[PDB]
Nucleic acid binder design. Structure first.
Ligand SMILES: [Mg+2]
Ligand SMILES: [Mg+2]
Ligand SMILES: [Mg+2]
Ligand SMILES: [Mg+2]
Ligand SMILES: [Mg+2]
Ligand SMILES: [Mg+2]
Lengths: 143, 47, 150, 46
RNA sequence: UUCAUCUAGACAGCCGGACGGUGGCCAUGGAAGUCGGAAUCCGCUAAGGAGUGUGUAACAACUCACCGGCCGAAUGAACUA
């Protein structure tokens, strides 16, 4: 009955942890029912976002710590009011669909997953400025 | 810098700069970055 | 050139747009008169949105879904009395329930005519759906448009 | 140069900037080096 | 004592969301969830009733059912002597 539906959630959750190779941890503090319903329409193509209770995810994560292991250290991020955005797109393009659009006075990206990695979405906000002047400012340390 | 030390030792060694490239280096110099500080180099300095 | 947005549904012949039109210096019977050029197809409830540029009679009556639905019934009469209280519950519109959701300008917010037209069929709380039918869970068993629609 | 980022890079990660932590580096990456090139990098260092 | 809920996070407390078809249909001065007749459909959903109440002339505004954040382990009913 209620074991019924919860287990159905473990199902469609486990399925996204496998299929999609990437993941965002977004925070929807406040954020209307109308805001969310329109980040769907914006990301309908590639990404798909899934929501739920904290205590349902800390378990389901560990519920399969067997296979798919590096979702393990996703747990010290699945606290507060969090949400999941699974995708198979590049970095930058997705985050700005989220971080920006349908914001009023929007939701926030707090951590990103890509094959056992934990991006702060702050080392993702790169502009080839400290990355081009490191393939060159060290070339003056070579010339 | 942390994500600009071995990445610069990659921006002055080997040849190109693939994801499977620096990962056989930082995980070989007995001192890697953070694995995510590495995959970033396969994004912010492309081509 | 000025700008605004006011909307008032229903549509009989062409009648006062209250105080919202008033403190704007449109007119009473004139804003209602330029709302006849709109209310013409159909003749039973609409959804008009009048635009306001200084004094502009822009009665662009945007498409009401329950109206493209109700209008897909038959015809008969127009006003006054109907020997009781009027009725309209028969229309087939089998492949017109989705040709209506197809007219749902983006909107829908779902999986094309699969979910848009399974809800427009639901919006029919007045007609009789595909030929001889009803609604409810006879929508979950639909096979048309969809792949052709999307 | 090639041994300029393997004998000057292993000198910041605690490694014998010579031929055990610079020449074997080419070996641990499938690259044909020489027993007198890193030595030519060891000499040019002085 | 028994039965039911509960670490797959209950109960209670404070706190967030409380959506789209859509002012759904008859009906009328006007009735858009809320004087009122009959249905209670879908979408999207973690969740949102074609609507619990407050309220407007009719919208607004608030509230709630429903979901969540926080916490951390008990809670509900029927009994026995
Ligand atoms: Mg309201
Ligand atoms: Mg009322
Ligand atoms: Mg639902
Ligand atoms: Mg217990
Ligand atoms: Mg008693
Ligand atoms: Mg007893």
């Amino acid at each position: 009955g209620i074991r019924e539906k919860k287990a159905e959630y473990f199902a469609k959750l486990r399925e996204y942890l496998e299929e999609y190779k990437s993941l965002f941890v977004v925070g929807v503090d406040n954020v209307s029912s109308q805001q969310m319903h329109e980040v769907r329409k914006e990301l309908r193509g590639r990404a798909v976002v899934l929501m739920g209770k904290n205590t349902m995810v800390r378990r389901a994560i560990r519920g399969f710590l067997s296979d798919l292991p590096d979702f393990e250290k996703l747990l010290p991020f699945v606290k507060g009011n969090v949400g999941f955005v699974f995708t198979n797109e590049p970095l930058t393009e997705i985050k700005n669909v989220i971080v920006s659009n349908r914001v009023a006075a929007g939701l926030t990206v707090v951590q990103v997953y890509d094959n056992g990695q934990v991006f702060p979405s702050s080392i993702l906000d790169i502009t080839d400025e400290e990355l081009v002047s490191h393939f060159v400012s060290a070339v003056s340390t070579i010339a | 810098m942390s994500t600009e030390s071995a990445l610069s030792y990659a921006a002055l060694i080997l040849a190109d700069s693939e994801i499977e490239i620096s990962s056989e280096k930082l995980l070989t110099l007995t001192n890697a970055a953070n694995v995510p500080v590495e995959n970033i180099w396969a994004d912010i300095f492309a081509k | 050139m000025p700008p605004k947005f006011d909307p008032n549904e229903v549509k009989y012949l062409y009648l006062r747009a209250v105080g919202g039109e008033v403190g704007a210096s449109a007119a009473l019977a004139p804003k209602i008169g330029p709302l006849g050029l709109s209310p013409k197809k159909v003749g039973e409830d609409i959804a008009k949105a009048t635009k306001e540029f200084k004094g502009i009679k822009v009665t662009v009556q945007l498409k009401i879904q329950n109206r493209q639905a109700a209008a897909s019934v038959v015809p008969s009469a127009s006003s006054l009395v109907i020997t009781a209280l009027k009725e309209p519950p028969r229309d087939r519109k089998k492949d017109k329930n989705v040709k209506h959701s197809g007219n749902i300008q983006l909107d829908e917010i779902i999986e094309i005519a699969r979910q848009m037209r399974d809800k427009s069929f639901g919006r029919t709380l007045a007609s009789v759906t595909k030929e001889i039918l009803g609604t409810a869970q006879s929508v979950g068993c639909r096979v048309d448009f969809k792949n052709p629609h999307d």
